[PDB]
Design a protein around this motif. Structure first.
Motif, PDB file in Angstrom:
ATOM      1  N   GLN A   1       1.054  -1.209   0.196  1.00 31.33           N
ATOM      2  CA  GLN A   1      -0.035   0.043  -0.050  1.00 31.33           C
ATOM      3  C   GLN A   1       0.808   1.110  -0.026  1.00 31.33           C
ATOM      4  OE1 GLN A   1      -2.332  -0.006   3.671  1.00 31.33           O
ATOM      5  NE2 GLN A   1      -0.494  -0.189   4.841  1.00 31.33           N
ATOM      6  N   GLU A   2       0.187   2.533  -0.551  1.00 29.21           N
ATOM      7  CA  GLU A   2       1.095   3.767  -0.458  1.00 29.21           C
ATOM      8  C   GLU A   2       2.316   3.377  -1.391  1.00 29.21           C
ATOM      9  OE1 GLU A   2      -1.514   3.157   1.325  1.00 29.21           O
ATOM     10  OE2 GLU A   2      -2.401   4.942   0.861  1.00 29.21           O
ATOM     11  N   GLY A   3       3.423   3.113  -0.322  1.00 26.33           N
ATOM     12  CA  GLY A   3       4.736   2.960  -0.835  1.00 26.33           C
ATOM     13  C   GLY A   3       5.455   1.918  -0.230  1.00 26.33           C
ATOM     14  N   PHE A   4       4.985   0.656  -0.309  1.00 24.25           N
ATOM     15  CA  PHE A   4       5.351  -0.612   0.422  1.00 24.25           C
ATOM     16  C   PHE A   4       5.489  -1.707  -0.764  1.00 24.25           C
ATOM     17  CE2 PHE A   4       5.796   1.203   4.811  1.00 24.25           C
ATOM     18  CZ  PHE A   4       4.981   1.939   4.896  1.00 24.25           C
ATOM     19  N   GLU A   5       6.067  -2.855   0.001  1.00 18.95           N
ATOM     20  CA  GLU A   5       6.229  -4.017  -0.944  1.00 18.95           C
ATOM     21  C   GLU A   5       6.470  -4.892  -0.185  1.00 18.95           C
ATOM     22  OE1 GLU A   5       8.877  -5.941  -1.815  1.00 18.95           O
ATOM     23  OE2 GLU A   5       8.007  -7.042  -3.478  1.00 18.95           O
ATOM     24  N   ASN A   6       5.974  -6.180  -0.483  1.00 16.42           N
ATOM     25  CA  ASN A   6       6.155  -7.606   0.282  1.00 16.42           C
ATOM     26  C   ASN A   6       7.411  -8.106  -0.292  1.00 16.42           C
ATOM     27  OD1 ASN A   6       4.659  -7.853  -2.045  1.00 16.42           O
ATOM     28  ND2 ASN A   6       3.997  -9.996  -1.685  1.00 16.42           N
ATOM     29  N   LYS A   7       8.552  -7.750   0.443  1.00 16.38           N
ATOM     30  CA  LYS A   7       9.868  -8.415   0.175  1.00 16.38           C
ATOM     31  C   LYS A   7      10.125  -9.726   1.002  1.00 16.38           C
ATOM     32  CE  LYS A   7      13.691  -8.569  -2.162  1.00 16.38           C
ATOM     33  NZ  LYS A   7      13.770  -8.834  -3.629  1.00 16.38           N
ATOM     34  N   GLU A   8      10.987 -10.635   0.312  1.00 16.46           N
ATOM     35  CA  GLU A   8      11.390 -11.882   1.098  1.00 16.46           C
ATOM     36  C   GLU A   8      12.753 -11.354   1.725  1.00 16.46           C
ATOM     37  OE1 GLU A   8       9.403 -14.322   1.196  1.00 16.46           O
ATOM     38  OE2 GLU A   8       7.903 -13.665  -0.256  1.00 16.46           O
TER      39      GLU A   8
ATOM     40  N   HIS B   1      10.598   3.056 -13.565  1.00 14.48           N
ATOM     41  CA  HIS B   1       9.691   2.143 -13.263  1.00 14.48           C
ATOM     42  C   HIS B   1      10.239   1.362 -12.117  1.00 14.48           C
ATOM     43  CE1 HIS B   1       6.148   2.399 -16.443  1.00 14.48           C
ATOM     44  NE2 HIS B   1       6.599   3.551 -15.695  1.00 14.48           N
ATOM     45  N   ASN B   2       9.507   0.671 -11.069  1.00 14.82           N
ATOM     46  CA  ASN B   2      10.097  -0.153 -10.076  1.00 14.82           C
ATOM     47  C   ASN B   2      10.464  -1.671 -10.771  1.00 14.82           C
ATOM     48  OD1 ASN B   2       7.478   1.391  -8.270  1.00 14.82           O
ATOM     49  ND2 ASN B   2       9.788   1.629  -7.964  1.00 14.82           N
ATOM     50  N   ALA B   3      11.194  -2.384  -9.992  1.00 16.16           N
ATOM     51  CA  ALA B   3      11.322  -3.853 -10.417  1.00 16.16           C
ATOM     52  C   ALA B   3      10.562  -4.929  -9.893  1.00 16.16           C
ATOM     53  CB  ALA B   3      12.933  -3.936 -10.128  1.00 16.16           C
ATOM     54  N   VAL B   4      10.070  -5.847 -10.739  1.00 20.25           N
ATOM     55  CA  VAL B   4       9.303  -7.134 -10.314  1.00 20.25           C
ATOM     56  C   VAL B   4      10.369  -8.093 -10.047  1.00 20.25           C
ATOM     57  CG1 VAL B   4       7.423  -8.385 -11.127  1.00 20.25           C
ATOM     58  CG2 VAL B   4       7.462  -6.042 -11.599  1.00 20.25           C
ATOM     59  N   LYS B   5       9.996  -8.532  -8.831  1.00 22.79           N
ATOM     60  CA  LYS B   5      10.862  -9.911  -8.147  1.00 22.79           C
ATOM     61  C   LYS B   5      10.159 -11.061  -8.210  1.00 22.79           C
ATOM     62  CE  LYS B   5      14.096 -12.356  -6.406  1.00 22.79           C
ATOM     63  NZ  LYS B   5      15.408 -12.476  -7.047  1.00 22.79           N
ATOM     64  N   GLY B   6      10.657 -12.143  -9.001  1.00 24.56           N
ATOM     65  CA  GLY B   6       9.825 -13.344  -8.964  1.00 24.56           C
ATOM     66  C   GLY B   6      10.014 -13.935 -10.192  1.00 24.56           C
ATOM     67  N   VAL B   7       9.753 -13.027 -11.354  1.00 33.05           N
ATOM     68  CA  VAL B   7      10.003 -13.544 -12.807  1.00 33.05           C
ATOM     69  C   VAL B   7      11.221 -13.944 -13.166  1.00 33.05           C
ATOM     70  CG1 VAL B   7       9.104 -12.806 -15.130  1.00 33.05           C
ATOM     71  CG2 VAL B   7       8.040 -11.888 -13.256  1.00 33.05           C
ATOM     72  N   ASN B   8      12.188 -13.213 -13.040  1.00 32.57           N
ATOM     73  CA  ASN B   8      13.583 -13.611 -13.339  1.00 32.57           C
ATOM     74  C   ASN B   8      14.359 -13.705 -11.834  1.00 32.57           C
ATOM     75  OD1 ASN B   8      16.131 -13.994 -14.374  1.00 32.57           O
ATOM     76  ND2 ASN B   8      15.741 -12.599 -16.227  1.00 32.57           N
ATOM     77  N   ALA B   9      15.496 -14.077 -12.225  1.00 34.12           N
ATOM     78  CA  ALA B   9      16.515 -14.192 -10.905  1.00 34.12           C
ATOM     79  C   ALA B   9      16.537 -13.080 -10.229  1.00 34.12           C
ATOM     80  CB  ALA B   9      17.785 -14.950 -11.224  1.00 34.12           C
ATOM     81  N   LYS B  10      16.904 -11.948 -11.104  1.00 36.28           N
ATOM     82  CA  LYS B  10      17.112 -10.579 -10.450  1.00 36.28           C
ATOM     83  C   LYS B  10      15.518  -9.731 -10.424  1.00 36.28           C
ATOM     84  CE  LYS B  10      19.535  -9.069 -13.880  1.00 36.28           C
ATOM     85  NZ  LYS B  10      19.493  -9.996 -14.918  1.00 36.28           N
ATOM     86  N   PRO B  11      15.414  -8.594  -9.721  1.00 34.95           N
ATOM     87  CA  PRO B  11      14.359  -8.095  -9.900  1.00 34.95           C
ATOM     88  C   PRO B  11      14.113  -7.119 -11.238  1.00 34.95           C
ATOM     89  CG  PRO B  11      15.717  -6.827  -8.379  1.00 34.95           C
ATOM     90  CD  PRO B  11      16.142  -8.553  -8.702  1.00 34.95           C
ATOM     91  N   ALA B  12      13.387  -8.055 -12.282  1.00 29.49           N
ATOM     92  CA  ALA B  12      13.188  -7.408 -13.471  1.00 29.49           C
ATOM     93  C   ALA B  12      12.206  -6.687 -13.549  1.00 29.49           C
ATOM     94  CB  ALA B  12      12.940  -8.915 -14.270  1.00 29.49           C
TER      95      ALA B  12
ATOM     96  N   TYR C   1       0.671  -1.573  -9.832  1.00 32.44           N
ATOM     97  CA  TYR C   1       0.823  -2.596 -10.772  1.00 32.44           C
ATOM     98  C   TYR C   1       2.044  -3.496 -10.370  1.00 32.44           C
ATOM     99  CZ  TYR C   1       4.627  -2.188 -14.415  1.00 32.44           C
ATOM    100  OH  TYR C   1       5.683  -2.099 -14.930  1.00 32.44           O
ATOM    101  N   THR C   2       3.024  -2.532  -9.972  1.00 37.59           N
ATOM    102  CA  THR C   2       4.416  -3.562  -9.516  1.00 37.59           C
ATOM    103  C   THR C   2       4.289  -4.097  -8.294  1.00 37.59           C
ATOM    104  OG1 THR C   2       5.067  -1.165  -8.685  1.00 37.59           O
ATOM    105  CG2 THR C   2       6.070  -1.692 -10.884  1.00 37.59           C
ATOM    106  N   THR C   3       3.419  -3.567  -7.259  1.00 34.51           N
ATOM    107  CA  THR C   3       3.171  -4.366  -6.274  1.00 34.51           C
ATOM    108  C   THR C   3       2.218  -5.368  -6.313  1.00 34.51           C
ATOM    109  OG1 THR C   3       1.579  -2.540  -5.629  1.00 34.51           O
ATOM    110  CG2 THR C   3       3.680  -2.425  -4.663  1.00 34.51           C
ATOM    111  N   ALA C   4       1.381  -5.357  -7.496  1.00 35.26           N
ATOM    112  CA  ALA C   4       0.694  -6.386  -7.677  1.00 35.26           C
ATOM    113  C   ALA C   4       1.301  -7.429  -8.359  1.00 35.26           C
ATOM    114  CB  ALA C   4      -0.719  -5.891  -8.553  1.00 35.26           C
ATOM    115  N   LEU C   5       2.085  -7.110  -9.172  1.00 35.87           N
ATOM    116  CA  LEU C   5       2.913  -8.344  -9.828  1.00 35.87           C
ATOM    117  C   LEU C   5       3.922  -9.005  -8.885  1.00 35.87           C
ATOM    118  CD1 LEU C   5       2.823  -9.652 -12.699  1.00 35.87           C
ATOM    119  CD2 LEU C   5       1.987  -6.980 -12.610  1.00 35.87           C
TER     120      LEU C   5
END
Lengths: 205, 124, 233, 325, 264, 283, 283
Positions: free
Chosen positions: D22-29, D208-219, D250-254
């Motif tokens: 939300q707002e400016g957060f992200e679920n990181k491992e 744009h932000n990076a999406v983690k999970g698709v590739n090894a790096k946050p793509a 959309y980045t946080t949703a992905l």
DNA sequence: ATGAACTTCAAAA
DNA sequence: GCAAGCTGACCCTGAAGTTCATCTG
């Protein structure tokens, strides 16, 4: 009302949100149709604008990825070398698509002395009837042809008959008001359409 | 799925070989291998090196059978099958070699039934 | 949207012979993994695994690249098990479901002994020959499938012209005459539909070849089935 | 409707309360979690991994949104509380010195400015004094399970204060308001509209932000770089007039969709799926339960909404599935 | 400078090899997922034309600029200079950042993704190599053998549709000499750009329609429907060009249009 | 370097044996599944030429690379230890290493390989490019198998006496394959392919099957080599016409083919006398 | 080692019996299904040469490997217990073991086998490579069967003492097969094939069918052996021409063949004495 | 002053 | 006598910040 039959074998209406990975809109872009109308016939005294678009062939996605470049072209660097500028850029093409556009035109600011509506009307009519055009139209990109044909009412069926699906904010037309002749700096204001009836009805600004 | 008017030499050759195999199978119950278990390996290639011996051996099989009417029906079938054989070729084409096996298994399936050969002979 | 999953999984059911380690519903990742060479890392993510499930989950026509890669893997593994048989029918049965192919009809999950197509009966014949070779010798090194499947699922005369002379000796090597008689009966009943051996098999017919091969193979792996069919000879 | 439908789905999942950003957060491992007290003092090096057959990078936690590093002088980014293992203890097994010490300097400057911009919290003060003590950071390496976080690279480190043992330093009701204001007032003074998927104002989301999970790096999903990726000379980022309040969503949703139960790859392509909840699809996401049972039926409740079957490559995300039916 | 409209239908074929694989699916030739007909992107045609020009020129005012490392290693005034000192710019155009119309040099030439007539049969020949590369897990101490993978087609006949105007030729410089060079390329550029993966590939047809006026006198759809390239009667699968039937329809373009058969 | 362009058609026949076996189908010959015509990949011919050159030369400036005891990384590290050590700029060091590998290794100019391993050094295209082979008459498959009285590994087949593993070794009754090859000019100038290298390549082509032989491939030789030479880098005639001149058809009465008498070859050289020359080497 | 290249054509006749059997045809002779011509695999000739060498030599440096009671893993473990124990680097230990197996075992230099079992040690190609055999005149199949008054296992006999299991033993009325064989030079240098080994191989070839005989194979002997010798590793003439010189055709009036008088043999040795020599051994 | 090459970011199923 | 060993592939080509070198300015 000017009716045009914009057909083709492939289509790649590259969206602005995903340019490094080209993705075609489910229908024909209004900006693409406007650029087609300009490439067929245009003059700094006539402003082309799309009024109604009716789809005639369903969607048909084909995964096609190309080895494109990411570097511009300038006068300093005399070469390019695509070995260090390779990009695996996908482009979901629309196989077997055809559209008809009912559009018209108005005047501009630099109309001059030769701004006759009937003259440009009959000129576009004879160009569409005899296959004349200033530049070959592009269906999403200039890598595809546009075997256009002049029509009057309805000479081809349409599968999109019931309520299909929406498309979101699509690229209507760029804002060329805040720019001198020969565009160089302009935004991309996207707009909505209507719903999911027979096609997309463009809304004038 | 059989066509007597195929007008193909391989088809009628295979059907003749099939009737001969049926003759061998009906000649005696206790048998480890019929004639088709050694002759089909070369009849499809060189039919002259197989069919001559099979036709010369057919009289003995007919003599050691069990019913003369069945022998008459089978020899009439052999006649009507090989009537289309205009000439024994030196070599069989691979297309003809495949049609050979096609007609062979077609004729074996047609024979191994119940009342079909006599019904076909009724109109003759 | 679940109607597409239903129309994809109702045809996904296959014959599946006895004592088979393959489940009734093949896992979609493992189902598409039969199109790869070995591991699920270096495949073809575009017109294949990146479009097969696309056409699957939407009741759409499967890509032709599916058929191409399936034929390639059948030429590679030299045997089609529970992985490509439950995926080759997805192209033909869906093409006939919407009307786009030629004159052939849809398919089922069992062994249809009719159809009268020039490609399916060839696959049934090839599977019958494979099972005859398997019954003649319980062990060997490479089945006649592993020797012919490279081009037998396409060229009838080019390989069967030198293959129909092998099953007689295979039946001769059988220690039980009744098994050989039943195999002869079933191969005759199958080839009764085959009108002739054509010069080749079209791309739309090689998939039928592999499907019929898998069908007859898993049907002859049953505990009691060939004897039950031969009882009505 | 590439990011329009994704934004609409995020606006549905966010207001449903089910572990989402939300707002400016992200679920990181975050793998190893550092636990301290009130004034610095490293007292625990906890690890919450052991999940699947491979030791993943710990559990998921709602940390501040990553500003997007990846560059030469990457220390000039300086994230809030979560980053790399060279931003906390200035350690580098394969990165080397100098380049890693400046990362720690930037991180301690960031936490110092966060402390001076938000005092009286008993949370940011601990992490601010922990990096300016020069006696506990060296003790962190001499912990109990420190020999395990060095063999695996990309080890993220977080801070957890005392009297909680459930909430990180970036979870108490204090810095959350600062992070929410950062993406509301600080991240809104740039280029004007118009937006791409919402049609409203919103600033143009540059980088744009990076999406983690698709590739090894946050793509990153959609990001324009190089030079030819421009339309009318927008120069990196401005090519797509996408707003922050939609690009972040959309980045946080992905990110949430690439780490939950809907994350499953058929082969070199992660074909994540979802629903409209008005999700409970139990069709595409039900392809990995136990031994594949028979859950397909016909209850006249088939939800709509398409599914996005994206695939990795080097550091971009390629879209291949597009079908509303 | 040319003042005529040109519409050229280019029929080429691939006998043995990969006409245009897919980077997203290994290297299989581009086919259609529905009808199954093969596809070839026009960018490969453009690159082959560039390579032929580099081979046949190697001088000023006829370069390519958009080249490779393994093959060849105020505003409008500079734009006109860059157009004049290159051939690809007068042919296919440029993207000069220091330009006018958003930095865009269009160009008269506009090709087309050539689509095959009949559905081709992609043959995947997984070959091998008796030599490993890097110290990988597949490079054992016993033998150093790795498996390969190639793609080919028994025969693929593709048909591209290219257009050439005159307004952009007057701006860039695509005169009659550049037009003749482009024709000599199209009729013979596959033979100059061969390789192992692409294998054998040549040109079998190039029917050009030249218009009297500078805009045209007939639609492109009718021109494409005139040249009918189909499959013969007793031919199911194709192996060479002798199995295709090509028929021209010059019975309705004799008004104010010229027809040229530079390919066949 | 060479200035002329060359297009050669090579007709080579096999009497018994598998020319190019497919690793996929165990050992089945690469035959067209839709027409029954045989296909031979160009990699086999290129490897045969490599083996012939390695057997005949064995000297400097005539390298081929060894068999299975060869590592590409080791060869690259050896080539990167001359004058282009480090002080040449990696953007220009790649080009320098490419030029040195083309000049010192004749195999790179003949049939180039890969140069991107642990240390990149560019890439070579090579003017000499060979295509796949194709047979006119559709060949047949025999599916000949054999056995072996010995046993490899002590697996489950190790019986109390009979330790046999069978085996498969395909063969072709007869097959006259036709291959096409091209040699440009600009790539030869960039790599260094001169006239002596061209003569050595022609000798390797005409002596390809005359040396390298084995058991699975059986008897293989050559039949003809028709080369068209353009006196410039421009092509005044398409190569398809030249390829259609050498017409090899079947017999008038015999449906199959077994020898050179069955394959009727016809050459129509009544138009290639402009700026092009015709040469015959194989026959 | 040898420095000359050799190409030999061996014409051998069989009067009665099955030369080479078909694995998937019980005992049918390997005959071309499309032309009726007989085909004999090279593995049979190689195994006959192996048996002859094992019967004549029986000493060191002349191994063949035993029959039935031989295990490849045991032989490899025995060969890996000399100087190349473990202190030789596996990458080089494989080459050392290959060289030792080529030097100590003459069968490896004659007809090499496999060396990749539980312990890999490389692979040998061998310069001596034989091809399949082919008959000119299409032979016929007799399908001669026989019976046996004894019973194998007590399960397939009758319900009484009438024990019979029949049997099949094919035979050929007459067949003159032609085989081709090649011997290079570089492989002989890598393995160690010298001139004495070459003479022993020629003796084994000319005394192949003169010793090993059985009941199913019947009477088999030789007819001729025409060897072409190139004085270098280069081939100044294609091997196809040399194979087409020895022309063996049928009789002018008799359509079949039954002896050497029916097969008309013609040798045209006019244009081949440039740098090549011709030798005759079988006849 | 801005187009092309250099260097750091996670360690894939 | 359901095979032996043998793989089933090379390398990149990313986003963004920091340097290299030739265009009108």
């Amino acid at each position: 009302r000017f009716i045009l039959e914009i057909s083709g074998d492939l289509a790649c209406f590259t969206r602005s949100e995903l340019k490094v990975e080209r993705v075609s809109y489910p229908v024909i872009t209004p900006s693409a149709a406007r650029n087609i109308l300009m490439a067929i016939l245009w003059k700094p005294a006539i402003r082309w604008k799309v009024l109604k678009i009716e789809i005639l062939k369903p969607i048909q996605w084909t995964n096609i990825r190309r080895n494109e470049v990411g570097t511009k072209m300038s006068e300093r660097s005399g070469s390019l070398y695509i070995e260090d500028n390779r990009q695996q850029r996908a482009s979901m093409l629309l196989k077997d698509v055809a559209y008809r556009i009912h559009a018209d035109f108005d005047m501009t600011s630099e109309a001059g002395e030769s701004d006759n509506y009937v003259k440009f009307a009959e000129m576009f009519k004879r160009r569409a009837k005899k296959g004349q055009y200033f530049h070959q139209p592009y269906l999403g990109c200039r890598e595809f042809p546009c075997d256009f044909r002049l029509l009057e009412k309805a000479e081809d069926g349409l599968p999109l008959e019931d309520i299909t699906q929406d498309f979101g904010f699509m690229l209507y037309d760029m804002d060329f008001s805040k720019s001198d002749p020969r565009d160089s700096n302009n935004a991309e204001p996207m707009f909505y359409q209507c719903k999911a009836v027979n096609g997309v009805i463009t809304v004038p600004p | 799925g059989l066509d007597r008017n195929r007008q193909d030499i391989g088809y009628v050759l295979g059907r003749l070989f099939a009737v001969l195999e049926k003759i061998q199978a009906e000649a005696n119950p206790g048998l480890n291998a019929t004639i088709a278990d050694r002759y089909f390996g070369s009849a499809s290639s060189t039919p002259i090196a197989v069919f001559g011996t099979l036709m010369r051996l057919l009289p003995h099989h007919l003599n050691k059978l069990e019913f003369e009417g069945r022998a008459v029906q089978l020899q009439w079938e052999i006649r009507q099958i090989l009537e289309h054989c205009q000439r024994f070729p030196n070599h069989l084409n691979l297309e003809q070699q495949g049609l050979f096996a096609i007609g062979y298994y077609h004729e074996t399936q047609f024979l191994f039934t119940k009342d079909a050969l006599k019904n076909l002979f009724n109109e003759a | 949207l679940s109607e597409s999953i239903a129309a994809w999984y109702d045809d996904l059911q296959m014959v599946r012979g006895e004592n088979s380690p393959y489940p009734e519903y093949m896992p979609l990742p493992r189902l598409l993994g039969n199109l790869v060479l070995d591991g699920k890392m270096e495949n073809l993510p575009s017109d294949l695994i990146a479009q097969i499930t696309d056409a699957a989950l939407n009741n759409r026509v499967l890509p032709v690249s599916l058929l191409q890669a399936a034929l390639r893997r059948n030429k590679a593994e030299q045997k089609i098990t529970y992985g490509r048989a439950s995926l080759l029918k997805a192209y033909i049965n869906r093409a006939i479901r919407a009307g786009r192919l030629k004159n052939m009809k849809e398919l089922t999950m069992g062994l249809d002994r009719n159809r009268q197509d020039i490609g399916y009966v060839l696959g049934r014949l090839f599977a019958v020959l494979e099972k005859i070779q398997a019954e003649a010798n319980p062990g060997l090194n490479a089945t006649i499938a592993d020797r012919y499947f490279g081009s037998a699922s396409s060229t009838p005369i080019a390989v069967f012209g030198t293959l129909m002379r092998l099953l007689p000796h295979h039946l001769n090597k059988l220690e039980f005459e009744g098994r050989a008689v039943q195999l002869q009966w079933e191969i005759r009943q199958i080839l009764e539909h085959c009108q002739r051996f054509p010069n080749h098999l079209n791309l739309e017919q090689q998939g039928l070849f592999a499907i019929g091969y898998y069908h007859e193979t898993q049907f002859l792996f049953t505990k009691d089935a060939l004897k039950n069919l031969f009882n009505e000879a | 409707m590439i990011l329009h439908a994704l934004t609409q789905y995020y606006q549905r999942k966010a207001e449903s309360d089910g572990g989402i950003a939300q707002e400016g957060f992200e679920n990181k491992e975050i793998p190893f979690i550092i636990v301290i007290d009130k004034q610095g003092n490293f007292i625990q090096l906890e690890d919450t991994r052991e999940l699947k057959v491979k030791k993943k990078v710990g559990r998921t936690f709602l940390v501040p949104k990553g500003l997007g590093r990846s560059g030469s002088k990457s220390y000039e980014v300086s994230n809030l509380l979560w980053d790399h293992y060279g931003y906390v203890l200035a350690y580098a097994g394969e990165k080397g010195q100098e380049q890693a010490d400046k990362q720690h300097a930037s991180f301690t400057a960031k936490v110092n400015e966060l402390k001076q911009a938000l005092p009286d919290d008993a949370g940011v003060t601990a992490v601010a004094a922990f990096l300016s003590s020069a006696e506990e950071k060296s003790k962190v390496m001499q912990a109990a399970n420190w020999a395990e976080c060095a063999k695996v690279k990309g080890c993220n480190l977080s801070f957890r204060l005392v009297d909680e043992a459930v909430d990180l330093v970036c979870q108490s009701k204090a810095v959350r308001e600062y992070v929410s204001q950062a993406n509301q007032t600080q991240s809104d003074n740039a280029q004007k509209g118009i937006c791409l998927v919402t049609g409203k104002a919103a600033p143009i989301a540059r980088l744009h932000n990076a999406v983690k999970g698709v590739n090894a790096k946050p793509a990153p999903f959609a990001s324009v770089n190089l030079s030819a990726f421009e339309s009318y000379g927008k120069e990196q980022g401005f090519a797509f007039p996408i707003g922050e309040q939609a690009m972040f969503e959309y980045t946080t949703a992905l990110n949430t969709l690439l780490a939950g139960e809907n994350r499953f790859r058929i082969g070199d392509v992660t074909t994540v799926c979802w629903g409209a909840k008005r999700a409970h699809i139990d069709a595409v996401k039900a392809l990995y339960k136990s031994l594949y049972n028979g859950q397909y039926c016909k209850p006249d409740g088939e939800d709509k909404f398409y599914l996005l079957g994206l695939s990795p490559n080097s550091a971009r995300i390629v879209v291949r599935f597009w079908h509303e039916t | 400078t040319i003042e005529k409209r040109y519409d050229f239908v280019f029929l080429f074929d691939v006998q043995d090899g990969n006409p245009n694989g897919d980077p997203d699916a290994g290297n299989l030739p581009r086919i259609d997922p529905q009808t199954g007909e093969g596809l070839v992107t026009d960018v490969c045609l453009k690159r082959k034309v560039r390579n032929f020009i580099q081979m046949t020129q190697n001088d000023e005012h006829h370069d390519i600029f958009i080249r490779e490392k393994g093959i060849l290693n105020k505003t409008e005034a500079a734009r006109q200079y860059m157009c004049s000192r290159y051939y690809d710019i007068r042919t296919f155009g440029a993207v000069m950042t220091t330009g006018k119309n958003a930095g865009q040099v269009r160009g008269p030439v506009q090709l087309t993704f050539s689509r095959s007539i009949d559905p081709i049969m992609t043959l995947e020949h997984s070959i091998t190599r008796m030599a490993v590369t890097n110290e990988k897990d597949a490079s054992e101490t016993g033998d150093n053998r790795t498996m390969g993978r190639k793609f080919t087609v028994p025969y693929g006949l593709y048909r591209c549709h290219g257009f050439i105007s005159t307004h952009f030729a007057k701006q860039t410089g695509f005169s009659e000499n550049d037009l003749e060079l482009f024709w000599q390329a199209l009729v013979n550029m596959f033979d100059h750009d061969h390789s192992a993966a692409r294998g054998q590939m040549n040109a079998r047809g190039l029917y050009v329609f030249e218009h009297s006026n500078n805009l045209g006198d007939a639609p492109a759809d009718s021109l494409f429907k005139r040249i009918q390239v189909v499959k013969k009667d007793g031919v199911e699968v194709v192996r060479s060009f002798d199995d295709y039937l090509v028929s021209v329809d010059d019975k309705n373009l004799e008004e104010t249009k010229l027809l040229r058969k530079l390919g066949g």
